[PDB]
């Protein structure tokens, strides 16, 4: 059974990890603290790599990750689970000030851009997806995340599923990927480093999480329509994100470790994901366990209201996935 109220004892819940989830966590924390002043919530934006590692090591109570744990992670770390909190997405941003259209791009073109074989933005493979668009001769400058990143996990899972015989074979997917060192290529720290690095030089392309889409567009960056394997091209939004997630509401597993990249929904946006709390089913004492249960239950309920999630363009958990999260939260003991 879920704990609905936190312990009356003062309890500090510490979080670290996903910069995609970080801005929303900085709304969840104070509101829950404004309702329960004895509960302290701290948050850091360090990437899903650090979120998983520190949660596993027990340095924080909540590891924030856009990537589910591998079975090796669950085998190596007893009692560690990923609990879905909300649905996010990822856009591809680019620096092309002379083009007003939302350029259409897919995994095979993005893979070639990141592999260095598509060198200019007017390459015929790009024009083929955008007929009649004034593509310039500007060089393609592919940016990737330097730190271990859940965004890198999503993006390379997209490249692998759309290019299984190429990128899928090498360099594959993961929070850390051996991106090719093609001219111009740079690694940027955090989502904020991708926004600023993409805005720094015309021609840059960067995979950026949707909680940073407002900041990206305010810097004049373009926002791409991404293609799914059904052949359609989608902007990230309520409809296409809900349509893709609805394609994975039914088949969502009990442990919630599922990829929703490039889903079967023909109108589904191909880069969506669950936002995970990487937590352990044993906290240090009973009061922390109760308060952690209370905070997590609050976040998938009152914290999933649009007044929170619209500020980062996230989508709520469907009711079936809500009950699945409650089941994992209920096992949080001491």
């Amino acid at each position, epitope marked *: 059974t879920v704990a609905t109220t936190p312990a009356s004892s003062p309890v500090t819940l510490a979080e670290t990890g996903s910069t995609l989830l970080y801005p929303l966590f900085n709304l969840w924390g104070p509101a829950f603290h404004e309702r329960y002043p004895n509960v302290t919530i701290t948050a850091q934006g360090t990437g899903s790599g650090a979120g998983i590692a520190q949660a596993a090591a027990g340095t924080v109570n909540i590891g924030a990750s856009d990537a589910y744990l591998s*079975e090796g992670d669950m085998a190596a770390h007893k009692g560690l689970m990923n609990i879905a909190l909300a649905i996010s997405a990822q856009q591809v941003n680019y620096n092309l000030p002379g083009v007003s259209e939302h350029l259409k791009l897919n995994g095979k073109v993005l893979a070639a851009m990141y592999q260095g074989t598509i060198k200019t933005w007017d390459d015929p493979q790009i024009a083929a997806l955008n007929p009649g668009v004034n593509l310039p001769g500007t060089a393609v400058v592919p940016l990737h995340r330097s730190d271990g990143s859940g965004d890198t996990f999503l993006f390379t*899972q997209y490249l*692998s599923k759309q290019d*299984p015989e190429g990128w899928g074979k090498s360099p594959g997917f993961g929070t850390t990927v051996d991106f090719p060192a093609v001219p111009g290529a740079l690694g940027e720290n955090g989502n904020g480093g991708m926004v600023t690095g993409c805005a720094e030089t015309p021609g840059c392309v960067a995979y950026i999480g949707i909680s940073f889409l407002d900041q990206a567009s305010q810097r004049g960056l373009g926002e791409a329509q991404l293609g799914n*394997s*059904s052949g359609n091209f989608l902007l990230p939004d309520a409809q296409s994100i809900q349509a893709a997630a609805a394609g994975f509401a039914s088949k969502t*597993p009990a442990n919630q*470790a*599922i990829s929703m990249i490039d889903g079967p929904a023909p109108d589904g946006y191909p880069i969506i994901n669950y936002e995970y709390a990487i937590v352990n089913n044993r906290q240090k004492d009973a009061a922390t366990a109760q308060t952690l249960q209370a905070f997590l239950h609050w976040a998938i309920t009152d914290g999933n209201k649009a007044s929170f999630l619209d500020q980062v363009h996230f989508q709520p958990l469907p009711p079936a996935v809500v009950k699945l999260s409650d089941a994992l939260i209920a096992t949080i003991s001491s």
Partner: antibody
Amino acid sequence: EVQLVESGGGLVKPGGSLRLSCAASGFTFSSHRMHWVRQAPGKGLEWVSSIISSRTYIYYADSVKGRFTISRDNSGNSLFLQMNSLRVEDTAVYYCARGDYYYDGVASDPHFDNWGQGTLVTVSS
Amino acid sequence: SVLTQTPSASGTPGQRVTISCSGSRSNIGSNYVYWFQQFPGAAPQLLIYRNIQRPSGVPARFSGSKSDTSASLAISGLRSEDEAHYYCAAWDDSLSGVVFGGGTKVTVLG
């Protein structure tokens, strides 16, 4: 090149048991959900089972659930199909097939990009 | 055979032959479709994956499409070498298993 070689087929009486093997090479074996698919002589393809590991989701067709065990030995590039309480209608060529890449442990699409030659199992008195 | 294909389809050389595969919301209506080619005596080979995607080595006259609970394989420029059985396949959410079509036997006339 990817190669899958099935073995262990033959004759079994109704109610008996038989264990099938599939030797894999040419790729990282643990990075793919592996499937079994069967085909009665002159008939269509019937999917049987799929597995990533003992710690992830394991699927069986309704026709075989409760009687078949799919398993694998990643250290030796081996997939297994142990069959129990076999029936006449289990007579088929059993194919070992490579499935989708290992993105998660829940999905099991019929992305069958490599097949073996198949081994014939005849269930008869 | 949960998915429904015509058991036999024919075409004259050079024409495009279309093989329909009708399913339901639970399988085709919610999952990627996969197409296979099988010659007498041989194992099936993957022709189309994920509705429309074509593996390397499969010629571009093989094509796929999907519409709601239905999918289609198109064989353009039909050749004598195309005489084979063709199966569609998809995951089925209700069964939590793979379902196949019964296979379409394709004869090249002439």
